Design a protein around this ligand. Structure first.
Ligand SMILES: Nc1nc2c(ncn2[C@@H]2O[C@H](COP(=O)(O)OP(=O)(O)NP(=O)(O)O)[C@@H](O)[C@H]2O)c(=O)[nH]1
Ligand SMILES: O=C(NC[C@H]1CCCO1)c1cc2ccccc2cc1O
Ligand SMILES: [Mg+2]
Length: 166
């Protein structure tokens, strides 16, 4: 089985770990022991082919920088998560990607933007802004929610597709 290391990036309150625990543990984060494994693992079939979906979540409310590059340098694809109610996350998506390029030493690398907390109600940045954000990079966009487990699998699965090419 192919091993895919996906580095999940997010602002802070967006809910990066939540999407991971939901896809991997089918549960909501914010109640697990951190630094236990450092990365998540999962076996699924995307695009009709069986591959290993290793979800690697990153820090959100810790201004992680030193380790931030570590995940990228060892990770293949990068899943960006933003909050519809937290416009602050919208600006985070671009600045974060810039960090991926420096470490990845490339331009077009496996990446996927996912609008977390979309099932809430208060969406500051309409889908137009989110969709246009991903288009600016040339990556697919998928709206999902770490609270309803809607699209969580899609967003994560989509990321693998880009990595498979690498
Ligand atoms: N309504 C809603 N709330 C969400 C969603 N995703 C995350 N949250 C909210 O996000 C909060 C948890 O975020 P967070 O502070 O990053 O928790 P953590 O990631 O476990 N800790 P840390 O940030 O230190 O890693 C909770 O208040 C949770 O309810 C979502 O899709 N919908
Ligand atoms: O460097 C790491 N560990 C020491 C050995 C064993 C695995 C490969 O190197 C290691 C680095 C990581 C970097 C980013 C995310 C998860 C990681 C998880 C890891 O286990
Ligand atoms: Mg967390």
């Amino acid at each position: 089985m192919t091993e895919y290391k996906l580095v999940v990036v997010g602002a802070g309150g967006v809910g990066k770990s939540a999407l991971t625990i939901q896809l991997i543990q089918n549960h909501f984060v914010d109640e697990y022991d951190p630094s236990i494994e450092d990365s998540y693992r999962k076996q699924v079939v995307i695009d009709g082919e069986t591959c290993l979906l290793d979800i690697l979540d990153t820090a959100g409310q810790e201004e992680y920088s030193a380790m931030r590059d570590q995940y990228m340098r060892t990770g293949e694809g990068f899943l960006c998560v933003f909050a519809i109610n937290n416009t602050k996350s919208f600006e985070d998506i671009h600045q974060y990607r810039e960090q991926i390029k420096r470490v990845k030493d490339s331009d077009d690398v496996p990446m996927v933007l996912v609008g977390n907390k979309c099932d809430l109600a208060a969406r500051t940045v309409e889908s137009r802004q989110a969709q246009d954000l991903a288009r600016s990079y040339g990556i697919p966009y998928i709206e999902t929610s770490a609270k309803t487990r809607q699209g969580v699998e899609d967003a994560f699965y989509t990321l693998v597709r880009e990595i498979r090419q690498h």
